[PDB]
Design an enzyme around this catalytic site. Sequence first.
Site, PDB file in Angstrom:
ATOM      1  N   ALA A   1      32.513  17.603  15.708  1.00 22.16           N
ATOM      2  CA  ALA A   1      33.694  17.964  14.930  1.00 22.16           C
ATOM      3  C   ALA A   1      33.773  19.468  14.699  1.00 22.16           C
ATOM      4  CB  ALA A   1      33.709  17.222  13.606  1.00 22.16           C
TER       5      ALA A   1
ATOM      6  N   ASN B   1      40.551  13.403   7.567  1.00 26.09           N
ATOM      7  CA  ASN B   1      41.124  13.000   8.850  1.00 26.09           C
ATOM      8  C   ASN B   1      42.310  12.054   8.702  1.00 26.09           C
ATOM      9  OD1 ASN B   1      40.017  14.402  10.988  1.00 26.09           O
ATOM     10  ND2 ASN B   1      38.272  13.007  11.244  1.00 26.09           N
TER      11      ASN B   1
ATOM     12  N   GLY C   1      26.457  16.799  11.923  1.00 27.38           N
ATOM     13  CA  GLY C   1      27.361  17.498  11.029  1.00 27.38           C
ATOM     14  C   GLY C   1      26.979  17.361   9.569  1.00 27.38           C
TER      15      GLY C   1
ATOM     16  N   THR D   1      35.212   6.439  13.268  1.00 30.34           N
ATOM     17  CA  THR D   1      34.089   6.622  12.356  1.00 30.34           C
ATOM     18  C   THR D   1      32.934   5.672  12.638  1.00 30.34           C
ATOM     19  OG1 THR D   1      35.284   5.250  10.755  1.00 30.34           O
ATOM     20  CG2 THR D   1      35.326   7.632  10.428  1.00 30.34           C
TER      21      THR D   1
ATOM     22  N   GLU E   1      35.896  36.807  -2.940  1.00 37.89           N
ATOM     23  CA  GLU E   1      37.175  36.653  -3.626  1.00 37.89           C
ATOM     24  C   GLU E   1      37.642  35.200  -3.658  1.00 37.89           C
ATOM     25  OE1 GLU E   1      39.974  40.213  -2.703  1.00 37.89           O
ATOM     26  OE2 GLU E   1      41.254  38.668  -3.595  1.00 37.89           O
TER      27      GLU E   1
ATOM     28  N   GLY F   1      27.795  20.189  15.118  1.00 41.88           N
ATOM     29  CA  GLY F   1      28.208  18.859  15.526  1.00 41.88           C
ATOM     30  C   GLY F   1      29.478  18.875  16.352  1.00 41.88           C
TER      31      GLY F   1
HETATM   32  N1  GTP Z   1      39.280  16.395  12.987  1.00 41.94           N
HETATM   33  C1  GTP Z   1      38.278  16.108  13.814  1.00 41.94           C
HETATM   34  N2  GTP Z   1      37.302  15.215  13.426  1.00 41.94           N
HETATM   35  C2  GTP Z   1      36.280  14.919  14.261  1.00 41.94           C
HETATM   36  C3  GTP Z   1      36.200  15.508  15.513  1.00 41.94           C
HETATM   37  N3  GTP Z   1      35.089  15.033  16.124  1.00 41.94           N
HETATM   38  C4  GTP Z   1      34.471  14.168  15.290  1.00 41.94           C
HETATM   39  N4  GTP Z   1      35.204  14.080  14.136  1.00 41.94           N
HETATM   40  C5  GTP Z   1      34.883  13.268  12.953  1.00 41.94           C
HETATM   41  O1  GTP Z   1      33.504  13.421  12.690  1.00 41.94           O
HETATM   42  C6  GTP Z   1      32.915  12.197  12.307  1.00 41.94           C
HETATM   43  C7  GTP Z   1      31.681  11.955  13.169  1.00 41.94           C
HETATM   44  O2  GTP Z   1      30.929  13.144  13.254  1.00 41.94           O
HETATM   45  P1  GTP Z   1      30.640  13.884  14.651  1.00 41.94           P
HETATM   46  O3  GTP Z   1      30.925  15.363  14.537  1.00 41.94           O
HETATM   47  O4  GTP Z   1      31.477  13.259  15.740  1.00 41.94           O
HETATM   48  O5  GTP Z   1      29.078  13.601  14.952  1.00 41.94           O
HETATM   49  P2  GTP Z   1      28.004  14.802  15.033  1.00 41.94           P
HETATM   50  O6  GTP Z   1      28.258  15.843  13.971  1.00 41.94           O
HETATM   51  O7  GTP Z   1      28.027  15.413  16.412  1.00 41.94           O
HETATM   52  O8  GTP Z   1      26.564  14.132  14.767  1.00 41.94           O
HETATM   53  P3  GTP Z   1      25.939  13.026  15.757  1.00 41.94           P
HETATM   54  O9  GTP Z   1      25.875  11.703  15.033  1.00 41.94           O
HETATM   55  O10 GTP Z   1      24.543  13.441  16.157  1.00 41.94           O
HETATM   56  O11 GTP Z   1      26.800  12.887  16.991  1.00 41.94           O
HETATM   57  C8  GTP Z   1      33.962  11.114  12.498  1.00 41.94           C
HETATM   58  O12 GTP Z   1      34.402  10.682  11.232  1.00 41.94           O
HETATM   59  C9  GTP Z   1      35.108  11.790  13.219  1.00 41.94           C
HETATM   60  O13 GTP Z   1      36.346  11.363  12.702  1.00 41.94           O
HETATM   61  C10 GTP Z   1      37.178  16.409  15.912  1.00 41.94           C
HETATM   62  O14 GTP Z   1      37.120  16.940  17.020  1.00 41.94           O
HETATM   63  N5  GTP Z   1      38.217  16.704  15.058  1.00 41.94           N
HETATM   64  N1  2RR Z   2      34.344   5.446  16.729  1.00 36.22           N
HETATM   65  C1  2RR Z   2      33.326   5.891  16.997  1.00 36.22           C
HETATM   66  C2  2RR Z   2      32.012   6.455  17.338  1.00 36.22           C
HETATM   67  C3  2RR Z   2      30.987   6.056  16.273  1.00 36.22           C
HETATM   68  N2  2RR Z   2      30.987   4.591  16.105  1.00 36.22           N
HETATM   69  C4  2RR Z   2      29.978   3.916  16.813  1.00 36.22           C
HETATM   70  N3  2RR Z   2      29.434   4.415  17.889  1.00 36.22           N
HETATM   71  O1  2RR Z   2      29.030   3.347  18.623  1.00 36.22           O
HETATM   72  N4  2RR Z   2      29.336   2.191  18.015  1.00 36.22           N
HETATM   73  C5  2RR Z   2      29.930   2.521  16.896  1.00 36.22           C
HETATM   74  C6  2RR Z   2      30.445   1.586  15.895  1.00 36.22           C
HETATM   75  N5  2RR Z   2      31.056   1.856  14.739  1.00 36.22           N
HETATM   76  C7  2RR Z   2      31.340   0.653  14.168  1.00 36.22           C
HETATM   77  C8  2RR Z   2      31.979   0.357  12.945  1.00 36.22           C
HETATM   78  C9  2RR Z   2      32.136  -0.978  12.614  1.00 36.22           C
HETATM   79  C10 2RR Z   2      31.680  -2.027  13.457  1.00 36.22           C
HETATM   80  C11 2RR Z   2      31.051  -1.759  14.658  1.00 36.22           C
HETATM   81  C12 2RR Z   2      30.907  -0.396  14.963  1.00 36.22           C
HETATM   82  N6  2RR Z   2      30.336   0.213  16.071  1.00 36.22           N
HETATM   83  C13 2RR Z   2      29.619  -0.468  17.165  1.00 36.22           C
HETATM   84  C14 2RR Z   2      30.488  -0.530  18.388  1.00 36.22           C
HETATM   85  O2  2RR Z   2      31.510   0.151  18.427  1.00 36.22           O
HETATM   86  C15 2RR Z   2      30.011  -1.249  19.555  1.00 36.22           C
HETATM   87  C16 2RR Z   2      30.728  -1.176  20.761  1.00 36.22           C
HETATM   88  C17 2RR Z   2      30.283  -1.859  21.879  1.00 36.22           C
HETATM   89  C18 2RR Z   2      29.110  -2.624  21.785  1.00 36.22           C
HETATM   90  N7  2RR Z   2      28.654  -3.314  22.902  1.00 36.22           N
HETATM   91  C19 2RR Z   2      28.385  -2.708  20.585  1.00 36.22           C
HETATM   92  C20 2RR Z   2      28.841  -2.019  19.476  1.00 36.22           C
END
Ligand code: GTP
Ligand code: 2RR
EC number: 3.6.5.-
Lengths: 55, 331, 418, 439
Positions: free
Chosen positions: D12, D206, D146, D179, D254, D10
């Site tokens: 992260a 985080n 992830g 998130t 270990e 992923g």
């Molecule tokens: N510390 C740290 N946290 C990260 C990073 N990238 C993403 N995160 C955390 O990972 C969470 C989201 O998971 P991601 O790794 O971005 O998503 P993914 O594993 O690629 O899975 P997908 O949904 O398919 O994109 C969020 O809570 C972020 O805060 C990073 O580069 N560093």
């Molecule tokens: N940060 C980061 C990436 C992951 N979050 C999401 N990725 O797309 N939308 C996300 C997400 N997370 C949320 C948590 C609470 C409420 C709304 C949320 N949304 C939706 C959001 O961000 C969005 C932005 C523009 C739009 N035209 C419609 C929706």
Amino acid sequence: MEVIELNKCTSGQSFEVILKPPSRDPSLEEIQKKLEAAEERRKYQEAELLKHLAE
Amino acid sequence: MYTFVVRDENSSVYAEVSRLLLATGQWKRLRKDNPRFNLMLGERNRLPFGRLGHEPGLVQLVNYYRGADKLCRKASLVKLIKTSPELSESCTWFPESYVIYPDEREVFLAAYNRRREGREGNVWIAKSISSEASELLDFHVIQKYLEKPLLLEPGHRKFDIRSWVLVDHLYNIYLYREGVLRTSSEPYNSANFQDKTCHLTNHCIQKEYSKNYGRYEEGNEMFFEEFNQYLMDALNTTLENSILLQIKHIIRSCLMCIEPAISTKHLHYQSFQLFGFDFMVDEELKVWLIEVNGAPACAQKLYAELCQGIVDVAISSVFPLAPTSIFIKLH
Amino acid sequence: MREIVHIQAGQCGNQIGAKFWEVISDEHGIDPTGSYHGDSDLQLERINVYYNEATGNKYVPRAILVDLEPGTMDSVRSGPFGQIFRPDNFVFGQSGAGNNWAKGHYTEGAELVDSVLDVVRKESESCDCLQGFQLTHSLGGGTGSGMGTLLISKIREEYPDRIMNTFSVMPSPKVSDTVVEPYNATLSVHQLVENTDETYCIDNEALYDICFRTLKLTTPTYGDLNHLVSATMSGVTTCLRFPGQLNADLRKLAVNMVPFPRLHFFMPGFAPLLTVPELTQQMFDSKNMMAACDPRHGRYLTVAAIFRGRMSMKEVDEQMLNVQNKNSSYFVEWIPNNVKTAVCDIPPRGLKMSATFIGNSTAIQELFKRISEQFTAMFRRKAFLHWYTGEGMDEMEFTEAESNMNDLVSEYQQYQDA
Amino acid sequence: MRECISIHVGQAGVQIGNACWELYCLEHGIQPDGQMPSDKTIGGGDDSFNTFFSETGAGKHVPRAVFVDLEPTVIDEVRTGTYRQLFHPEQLITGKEDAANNYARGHYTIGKEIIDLVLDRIRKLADQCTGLQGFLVFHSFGGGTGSGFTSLLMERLSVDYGKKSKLEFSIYPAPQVSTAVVEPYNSILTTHTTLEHSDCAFMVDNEAIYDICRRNLDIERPTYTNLNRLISQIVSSITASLRFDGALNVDLTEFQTNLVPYPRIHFPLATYAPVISAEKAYHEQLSVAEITNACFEPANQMVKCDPRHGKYMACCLLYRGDVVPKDVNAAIATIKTKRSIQFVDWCPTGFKVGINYQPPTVVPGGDLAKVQRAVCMLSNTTAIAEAWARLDHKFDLMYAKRAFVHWYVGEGMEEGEFSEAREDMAALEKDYEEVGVEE
Ligand SMILES: Nc1nc2c(ncn2[C@@H]2O[C@H](COP(=O)(O)OP(=O)(O)OP(=O)(O)O)[C@@H](O)[C@H]2O)c(=O)[nH]1
Ligand SMILES: N#CCCNc1nonc1-c1nc2ccccc2n1CC(=O)c1ccc(N)cc1
Ligand SMILES: Nc1nc2c(ncn2[C@@H]2O[C@H](COP(=O)(O)OP(=O)(O)O)[C@@H](O)[C@H]2O)c(=O)[nH]1
Ligand SMILES: Nc1ncnc2c1ncn2[C@@H]1O[C@H](COP(=O)(O)OP(=O)(O)O)[C@@H](O)[C@H]1O
Ligand SMILES: [Ca+2]
Ligand SMILES: [Ca+2]
Ligand SMILES: [Ca+2]
Ligand SMILES: [Cl-]
Ligand SMILES: [Mg+2]
Ligand SMILES: [Mg+2]
Ligand SMILES: [Mg+2]
């Protein structure tokens, strides 16, 4: 306060300090079954959708 | 606009404190399960301390100290004093106590025979009052009973003192200048230990059982002004000199002992707490610690002043709103 | 996912669609000729989401223009950015839909829908990884409403695993063309509840009031109305077009905004119609909602706030927490952290900084209830029904559509008391 | 010499993998092209750094690592990054369509399509190992990939490599750091399915890293780059014993032996000190006692919790720089009299200490200043269960109304798995409680 197992090398050292003394993983088959079972449920729901759209 | 939640409906103290915050107009009460609060007036049991201080951009304060139960539980308090180097066995203000599981079973009897044989008054009390060790163990912690208490005249009656103490987020120790005396209206007789009416000062048992309730003072409550006056007229001394010095000493000793365990000075959330200390005085004008109350109720007369004080020093100090002190800073 | 296929249907669909492309072409530095002349490289990093690249450094919008009459689409071709569109993606008939849903859905539109899917297929076949589709249309007319929903239905059949997104214009007696608009809208919404993942409800009533009670426009035209929509559409799709905190796609948007499949109708908002507190307080205000609904009459399931330009995001978070505490009773407790704050570095043209609101509120039931009342007012007397029965429809289909939207209203009411 | 294979899943996992391998190359003096001048045995050797790096005929040191993501754009940055030469193309695996923050999408739908490819690419690294130790898995809890794909991978790894140990570096979700709203779902789901496949797992919240970057580095709004460079330091401290000559934690087994008495309770708390901003002109170097004392300050932990209200099962001190055993003991003695350190009454109240004379390496132009001594404390405490409690609480709130569940069921998952996962977490919370037991 005892110091036990002191190992010294040229990059550093390590030791232990005692202060007070004390008082069946799933098979490849079963994983394939779960992955395929979920796939069938997806195909079923899609079929229901296409049936609905056909109506 | 500050936000708070109420999670203890039974708390008469914080019901009043809640009323005051709303009257300011700068505090808004949310639903009890809304996590986006500034101040939690939490529940007595199983307070979710682990969920505090995890909301982005939200400074959170709670009205309880995680770990204060070590001081507010009978068995823990006895265990705390006997094991803490700060308090130690050389604690001359806490009665000889022993913890008993239905432990200190051998030691209690080992010291019991050291008093019966010596013909010294060997009466003990156990809760969670007999002179026989067999009657007690058959019946929790066992505590030595002050057979020679300070008696008030007229009435020839015993009493106990309640001190309200507030400890803020900076671990400052504030002693409310207004304490209260809860008195048993029945005259103390040493001989009868079956009848606890003259021997219990506690209002709940006093309210109903005392066949002379409310005889001398209203609600069997004497406040600091009269008790100080009596001490001057009867014993040629003051409440401050003869008693309050030891009280402030005991409070400071107990609270400084557990400070590194409960402090929130560098924690992700903040804590403050109102404590209820209960004391006893013998005929030698010596003060003994009885117990420490975690969720104490105040006296009806002193509710308005204390609850306002709590807002000013414990709450507004963290969340400022848009002059003598009712507290004595002990720390 | 990468590529998005845009579709615009009917007069309203093609007029707002054309305006949307004019706006974002400017933001991505694309001229009417399709040539790039931008200064930043952030404009080209995710430009392939809405644009195909033709040989000669030319960017052609992945857009398909549909109508049952050439009138509006002729004006589009003669418009500002009219030459940027692929000529083969102009699919039109000559009959028109006569503001009749049945004509677009069952008779006139059924004849044309195949050639549209041919163009859709061609665009989709040359996609590296198709995200899904975005449709712009009104629900009050015949083509965008009738044929638009017919299109969506058949697109879902051919692409059942792709996302369907709509910018749908809700009709209003304040800005009305015909009296049959409640009929057309009621039939369309039922299609939308079943066949879209995300619908941005754009109320013409709200657009009119904003132009009237705020922008101080005595006689608002459709151009004035579309100005608000263009700005809104640019703001809501920013997280798709540009690199940023979110860096999202159509599916990730739907996942985070839609806790229940049927409840996917959003209330968009924009500001200004400048200081950060002013920008924040305004975006959460009813006067800035593009759907004529009072948020204080319902509850927010999920909220997305997107900020554009340069500003202290520390100050924003403070203000975001501020507006949340004011409206603490208007959010649900059973969806933790349901408010998203996001930033984009690229500001829109003419503004130093702005903010876009995207809320999934239960208060939107007031929109569907409003349409339902107007529907029933005529339907109880079977008024104007002959226009529809003459196209093969019968009263039963109307009764179904009436029931389905009532159910939708009930579903929003359920989560308002939870 | 026994090799260790790293897996990054992923966004992260990959982005953190980048920061770690950037740091590893700086610590071992490996240039971005893979050339290591200080290394004299060209083409091979069984040195300690060979646990993470294999060698080619051209004196090129290749990371025993595999990057996996269901979407190309993140790993594409590695293919074009500063250390692009470092990785062979087969080590970098990308899909075309991510999991959309959906565990089900990552585990079932998209997972089965790419899982066999990943294993074969991992098998190739495994075949180059004379004696494979096990795997180090980097991933987030919240992400669809992830969480979803990782749990699937952990199952297949336990099948194909049943004897090898598996360690985790897991990113705990924090609402302030980008998130998805359904990240509590993904966290619980991935934990339940991975629990019996992980021998030791280091959780990094985080939230904790975010506040540390604000408090100690004066960064008003920390980016992923800021967060990852700090995390890489903690990761480096933990893996230093595998890459350098020493006697403590010399192999993956270990870690389990020294930190994890009970298999299910395998989430040690990590605390790091000191963290100083490089922009700070005048800085005074902290002593052994000072940095050791900071290991018991909650503001320095990778997960915010209060160890004073829990019980220790094990404690490991990892020093780097000018540190001698004498000063360590004197520091510990002082700490035991001031701090509240309670162990379980079935464990030796003690500290296993490891010292590496080489001071912490910092990235040139980074946010961290170069210090003369630093320490990472690994302590298995029941206090970390607080993190499970708040995470499970958010789960319960959403699941009561079955919010967002349709997104998971629509991918072939069942509502039963949700409740099944939650009950295991309920059992896990209960396991921690058994161990760390008006008026
Ligand atoms: N510390 C740290 N946290 C990260 C990073 N990238 C993403 N995160 C955390 O990972 C969470 C989201 O998971 P991601 O790794 O971005 O998503 P993914 O594993 O690629 O899975 P997908 O949904 O398919 O994109 C969020 O809570 C972020 O805060 C990073 O580069 N560093
Ligand atoms: N940060 C980061 C990436 C992951 N979050 C999401 N990725 O797309 N939308 C996300 C997400 N997370 C949320 C948590 C609470 C409420 C709304 C949320 N949304 C939706 C959001 O961000 C969005 C932005 C523009 C739009 N035209 C419609 C929706
Ligand atoms: N906001 C907006 N609404 C429009 C516009 N043109 C038409 N409408 C609305 O759309 C409805 C008429 O549908 P229309 O698109 O003209 O018919 P169609 O060609 O069959 O799709 C009416 O309720 C109008 O208020 C426009 O340019 N902007
Ligand atoms: N050591 C003692 N000597 C004499 N009286 C005592 C002693 N300890 C408690 N008491 C009496 O018991 C009463 C309260 O006892 P306490 O232990 O607080 O009861 P409970 O445990 O039910 O709260 C007081 O009125 C006090 O006079
Ligand atoms: Ca015809
Ligand atoms: Ca070599
Ligand atoms: Ca195993
Ligand atoms: Cl094996
Ligand atoms: Mg028309
Ligand atoms: Mg017209
Ligand atoms: Mg991803």
